[PDB]
Design a protein around this ligand. Sequence first.
Ligand SMILES: [Zn+2]
Lengths: 189, 94
Amino acid sequence: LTCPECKVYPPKIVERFSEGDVVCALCGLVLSDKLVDTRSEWRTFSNDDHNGDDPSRVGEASNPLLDGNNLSTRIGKGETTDMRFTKELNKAQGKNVKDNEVQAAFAKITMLCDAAELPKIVKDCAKEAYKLCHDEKTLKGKSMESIMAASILIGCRRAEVARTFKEIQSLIHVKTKEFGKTLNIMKNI
Amino acid sequence: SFNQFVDYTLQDIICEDSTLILEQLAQHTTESDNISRKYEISFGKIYVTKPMVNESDGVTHALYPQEARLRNLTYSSGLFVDVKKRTYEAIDEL
DNA sequence: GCACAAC
RNA sequence: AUAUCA
DNA sequence: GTTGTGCTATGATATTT
Ligand SMILES: [Zn+2]
């Protein structure tokens, strides 16, 4: 936005949220009137409503960085439900199910962090380190259980969670010199 | 109420279903078949420390109620259980 | 948990 | 979602 | 005869993931 009347290069404008207006601080011209509360709007996606009574709660938050954009609900039991139709509609989801399956290597990272007592911020860095280096030609053919063992120390080394390489050698697995070279070809990327 | 749950109830919850076993019985063709095994996993005494905290830099130390309220931590203590893993085997009852 | 509406 | 207000 | 299907006071305010 830039005031149509004034036009000074550093466009000094204020967001008078309380009056729901966007004003030019110099001439006072209102540049916009429709203005939305982003906090409360975000409350509609990530709420505390797990029961299902909130009429405001109408969407859900996702993580486009880690799981791409895979929107998908799950057939489950409701109040008035026969245990028959749940099974059929779930047995029908089985026929509809390669790299769209290597996302189960996130389940390998998640089950490793929880076995290593690691926080929720470390898993999401280990999952982003693994997604951006598992199909690299720079890693080529490294021990596939030692490149995800190296991306956990990459996620810990940014989230400030102290984990020695010998601490991850105890988890899995690690071949020392094998997951030490792999911890460097990724570090360049 | 809570004390009764920690001193008694907790142990009995660890001991009701408790032990779980997995049996691997062979095809009885010939070696390396004809080997029937049963593995055990058992849960004994349950321990419970004084409240502690696991900081980001590995170090674990005691945690008082005031530090919990200020650093928004949880005033929890560690649950430890004695585990035992037995192994058994038979050929093609004992 | 109503109370009335259709199978 | 709880608590609450007349 | 049984099942099955709508709804069940007005507004307000304060936290908790
Ligand atoms: Zn202006």
